[PDB]
Ligand binder design. Sequence first.
Ligand code: MET
Length: 186
Amino acid sequence: EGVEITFNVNDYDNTLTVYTTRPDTFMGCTYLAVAAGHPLAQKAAENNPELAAFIDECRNTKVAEAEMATMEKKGVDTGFKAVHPLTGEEIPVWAANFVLMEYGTGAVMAVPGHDQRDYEFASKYGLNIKPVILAADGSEPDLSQQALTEKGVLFNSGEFNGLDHEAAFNAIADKLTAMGVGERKV
Ligand code: MET
């Protein structure tokens, strides 16, 4: 059980769609990551040689999911901005070597405040790291050095503040659904 979530992207005729099993952190989404082989990444490749090079470098490295906690994570800013549906604010779309086309939409929403892979990528590239879950003693999480990986009560999540994990999961899934922008999967 998770959700597909659809973002519009400024100056791009298609949409971006992401799967996650953690809609509860969705207010903490500070950027999107697409596979090198993804249509948006290659529409952008057209006016970007750094990305052309990166895409070719990736086409060589057969990155396997199980080998990923090991590999140097790498990526490039596509230039495209996506609009966060709940928030209204623009977030960068990056191409990343750790996102694949084979399984999934070839795109992922990232919450570096609460997923460690996400935290390492954002640390390395200067992307925003947003706390939305509280530590288990109900303090603000320490995000000076690593991601707070625990499930917990949301904060700094607007209308969703105060909700525990299961309540957040449903309240944010239901909202994205009522906005016709999200879909539960079984
Ligand atoms: C911060 S936990 C959720 C983030 C992760 N990228 C996911 O889509 O599940």
